[PDB]
Amino acid sequence: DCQEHDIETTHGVVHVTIRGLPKGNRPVILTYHDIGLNHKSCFNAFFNFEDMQEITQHFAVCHVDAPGQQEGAPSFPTGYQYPTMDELAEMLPPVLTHLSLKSIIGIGVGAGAYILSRFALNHPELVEGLVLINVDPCAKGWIDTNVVDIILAHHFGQEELQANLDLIQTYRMHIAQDINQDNLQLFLNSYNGRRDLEIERPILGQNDNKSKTLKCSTLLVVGDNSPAVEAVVECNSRLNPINTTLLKMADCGGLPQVVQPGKLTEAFKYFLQGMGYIPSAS
Amino acid sequence: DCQEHDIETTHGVVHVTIRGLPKGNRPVILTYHDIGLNHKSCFNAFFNFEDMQEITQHFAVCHVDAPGQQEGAPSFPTGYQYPTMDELAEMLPPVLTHLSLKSIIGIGVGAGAYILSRFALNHPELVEGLVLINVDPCAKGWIDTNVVDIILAHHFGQEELQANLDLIQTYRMHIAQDINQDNLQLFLNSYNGRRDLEIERPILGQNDNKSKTLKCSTLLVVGDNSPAVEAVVECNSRLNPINTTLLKMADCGGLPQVVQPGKLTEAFKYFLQGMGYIPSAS
């Protein structure tokens, strides 16, 4: 039913978790997490939600852990060359060849969402569709205390983060303990050094300076209280509106998939129906 | 390549025109023209365009003429029971069944857009997606001189009607000469008899009091200078935004398939790419 693979890439080893069994024609739901998290802390609560098991049983599900972010991972040596964001994206095609995966439907949070975008631009033939949570298609442009507090700021809004409710302290413990703290630095370093996605919205008038844009279907997802609102909004204006949709989720900040899974599952179902998959869903 | 069929239905005879052959589990691009037009005056100028014949090589094209609206159609006898807009939609499964078709990608104009929309709600299993040009989901809301002058004003905006005579004059003659004038008044009457499409936008928490909507991918099209702007915007407001995109074509009159085929074809190509069809550039 399930399996775990330490897949050999040109940029090192990538740890994956396959759930279910895919047929040749149907794509796999490939998953890619955010900084401070892994496939478990990011997605398991969402994917194992009642309404999601109705959807996921029809598909296979391939959960990608970022280098040295998988649970029980050993510490990378001090001066280890940690894969760049673009290089992380180049580690995905080898995963698809190893597991004989013909194509994917991508779900990504933050850093994961960037990587799956780069992957989708790198290979439109492999990506059928994307669900991009808290995506930032822009470079940071900000380089300077506590890596855990830096990542908590990336995820949760100031109002939300200042309050320090059960959710905040829960995910403080996740980021602190679940992930190798030496490797988390390097993964955050890679993400903070991401380049501009170089996407621009096409104009039907004529070719737009050969600006690239996601060919596949794209569902953008952001919480109203999220610090990534302006980033996801900017990403929406730079993507093809005919193949892109913007979901603003109410009374919600960081990690919409964990806080409002019932709403995001319904959004996901509609998204999968539009593509022609899972018609009988009543 | 070419075959025209006079398909026998319960609501009478429907004229269809099949271009190319449909094979290998791919949908036919089924079309439905507007009031005062037929498939020739509505689509042949759009479909014979250089950038459209590149797409239609891989697809099969089924041109549906509305009862009596086809070329050289004999006049319906005085007091003929002309099918309702809901009955016109109930004639489409016979078409799909008669021609051994599994499903369609629908291109509807005005009344044709309403008819394809009703067909999609009745039979979501038979419709993979809809391009709806100048669609109005709401009933006229009231009842009634020169039929040609009415249909011109239906199609064409105020500043457009007197600015570009070349189009208005050519189509004045299409509405007047190329179609049976007895039958035309009946098709017009049927369209003005249309009920509310009874679609509502889904709430991501709420259950709409079990209101229905289009479960397929939909591209709403209308020109900035069309008299059908607010009706198509009103249609957009009542559809699922995750499955629906609105295209307001800048500097575009009543007929974007006639006026701006270059831009609309490009839009339709992106629309088909989102569904997973026609991956590579044409």
Residue numbers in the entry:
A (entry chain A), B (entry chain E): 29 to 172, 183 to 320
What text does the study give?
Among them, a truncated construct (residues 29–320, NDRG3 ΔNC) with an N-terminal hexahistidine tag was successfully crystallized. The disordered region in the cap-like domain (from Trp173 to Leu182) is sequentially matched to the helix α6 region in NDRG2b. Interestingly, helix α8 of chain D, E, and F were structurally different from that of chain A. In the crystal packing of NDRG3 ΔNC, helix α8 of chain D, E, and F were influenced by adjacent molecules while that of chain A, B, and C were away from adjacent molecules. Therefore, the crystal structure of chain A, B, and C of NDRG3 ΔNC seems to represent the structure of NDRG3 in solution than that of chain D, E, and F. In the crystal structure of NDRG3 ΔNC, the crystal contains six molecules connected by disulfide bonds between Cys30–Cys30 in an ASU, whereas it was grown with monomer fractions in purification. However, the predicted solvation free energy of the dimeric interface between chain B and chain F was −11.5 kcal/mol, which is more stable than that of chain A and chain D (−4.8 kcal/mol). Taken all together, our results indicate that NDRG3 ΔNC forms a dimer, wherein the chain B/F dimer represents dimeric interactions of NDRG3 ΔNC.
The N-Myc downstream-regulated gene (NDRG) family is a member of the α/β-hydrolase superfamily and is repressed by Myc expression. Although NDRG3 has a high structural similarity to the α/β-hydrolase family, the substitution of the residues of the enzymatic catalytic triad and narrow folded cavity due to the presence of helix α7 and helix α10 indicate that NDRG3 is a nonenzymatic α/β-hydrolase fold protein. The NDRG3 ΔNC structure includes two domains: A canonical α/β-hydrolase fold domain and a cap-like domain. Compared with NDRG2, the helix α6 region of NDRG3 is a flexible loop.
